[PDB]
């Protein structure tokens, strides 16, 4: 009865952080169009990803192209979705003692004031690790934990000696990207 | 009493997958030295990891250098190891009509004889995702999802129509290189 | 004269595996083979994984799965290929001789001198920076030094400063190109 | 004459943050200032974030926090650095005119042609080979086409077929050089 003539897609371009979502609208022409069905896809699904209306969920840093193509014409319009990377800020969760930081993708556990310091942690269902950390070589330990993606599930405890003698922490989860603490 | 002249790592290389592991040995020379201790590290830690007792776990691929230092002398020994990337075959976990494909490190959802095929899964404690999955143009459906890490745990289900009208399948758990399921 | 519309499209093969930099063509069949307007676009769905060209020659750019498309120009018919991209196999290739060289294995290279008081390594990865290293000593005169995480065509320019005893001494500059240098399997 | 042993080492900066291809220098301070042996030997517990120089030259090849320990030759004294390194700034820089070229977007290209009925793509990544592609028509005239995760020092030569309208043209070859060649903020 009225066939569609165009589409676009408002907003044109979007950033979002991995985990974060942005809502993109097809606009089919005329107003009073019969079919107004879209389909939405993406060239750079590793990035982003799209559901059948069009909510965009970043994935991975990158830039990636999102389309509403017309079940009616087949016209097609993009948008640009830049997904970021994550703030380059440091996240203290722990006391003055134990605990770790979160400094983009990787995490930072520490122990000051100890003889000696060794960390048990599991990433997701992944095994049991277990590690000594690194002497500063003042009294204090560090060990990085590398390239957490976002929902990365963290179990850890610590092994140390602050001097009254060796003592185990309780089992602690860390989420990434949705455990939050003090900035540095 | 007795002072280290030396120290050798056995095995002197090693291949593990990642989530694999493999125990390496120092031997202290003379037999009856009077100190004995080592430190194991590592130079490339996001390769592998060492415990504080010399046992290497794969943790991406990669070749990395892992030593042995006495305590006493500071005498060095290393061994190589290379973490492999996972098989290239085709693990199929699901029936006629659907499941996944583990392909290496991505995972290949399909759906066979639809109208239709939507995924829903969440990645870790990361977000539900929903997407229609693609057609391959002959009534079957797919959707790959990129880049799993050893322990992942993904939970999904389908919303197809196989002919009769729309149904969700229940909720249904895969663990990276853990779940099993038969080779294509 | 008549239009003959499009009615479908099959694309052949319907899978296939690559590695990186790698091609394998595809290829749309309309029907009917009559059809007027035989034009296809292709598209790909993970495009870090795998690029499409205008004539559907896929090649490999990353490990992982995905799904290259063509599209009828006519009647918007679609049909889907899966294209794995695989990783390199778990072989060991030496590059040099028994004194000093490279070992490709899978997409890190082992760096070696056999015989020597120390060893230094002097290298650059395609335009970046010149990086010095002091290589690791295994504790028997030898020594190594990983170089990770290379894609294909990365241009590695190196050279050694070594001393197998008499005295220390710079080698020549050599050129490896990651996924075309070849040499012997270990 | 006496031999004066070495008591300690610290390290200073005790932490730093460089970008990809950036350096940072380290400096061990042996304890007594008058110890015979000054000597250090520098490591990293993770090579595929930062490289050290023999000399405590740290430079960052790829994102992520990593310590650097400098060791002193007599009685191996320790003292540790945390090095961590960036990922780009959250910004974009237009290379070209108002017609073609392509925006850096951390470390994705995202080429660019404004006015015409098509518009292809023609690249290659170092040694790499020749990629073609058709870039995706936004809707309105204007094409645009991803590359994705680029490493600093990558070389790309590329150069665009397209037409504004009269007839078809190639554009010259091009260089871009990731994280060298620079361009105006947008
Ligand atoms: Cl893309
Ligand atoms: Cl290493
Ligand atoms: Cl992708
Ligand atoms: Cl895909
Ligand atoms: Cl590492
Ligand atoms: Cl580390």
Redesign the interface.
């Known amino acids: 009865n009225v066939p569609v003539t ?4 408002n907003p ?1 371009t979007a ?1 979002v952080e991995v ?1 974060q ?1 942005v809502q993109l609208n097809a606009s089919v022409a005329p107003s009073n169009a019969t079919n107004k069905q879209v ?9 982003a ?4 209306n069009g ?1 965009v ?1 970043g ?7 999102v ?1 509403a193509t017309t079940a009616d014409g ?5 948008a ?1 979705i ?1 997904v ?3 703030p ?1 800020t440091v996240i203290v969760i722990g006391d003055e003692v134990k605990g770790l930081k979160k ?4 995490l ?1 556990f520490y122990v000051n004031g100890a003889t000696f310091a ?1 960390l048990h942690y599991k ?5 049991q ?4 950390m ?5 009294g204090n330990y ?1 060990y ?1 934990v ?2 957490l ?5 963290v179990e850890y405890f610590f092994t140390y000696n602050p001097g009254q003698g060796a003592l185990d922490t309780p089992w602690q989860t860390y ?1 990434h990207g ?1 455990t939050q603490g003090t900035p540095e």
Do not use: F, M, R
Not at 74 to 78: G, L, P
Not at 103 to 106: A, E, L, R
Not at 149 to 153: A, M, N, P
């Open positions: 165009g589409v676009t897609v044109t950033q985990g979502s389909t939405w896809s993406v060239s750079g699904s590793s990035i990803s799209v559901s059948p909510l969920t994935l991975a840093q990158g830039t990636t192209t389309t087949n016209k097609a319009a993009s640009t830049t970021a990377p994550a380059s400094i983009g993708d990787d930072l060794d990433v997701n269902n992944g095994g690790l277990n590690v000594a690194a002497p500063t070589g003042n560090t990085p590398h390239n993606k976002h929902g990365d599930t989420v949705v």
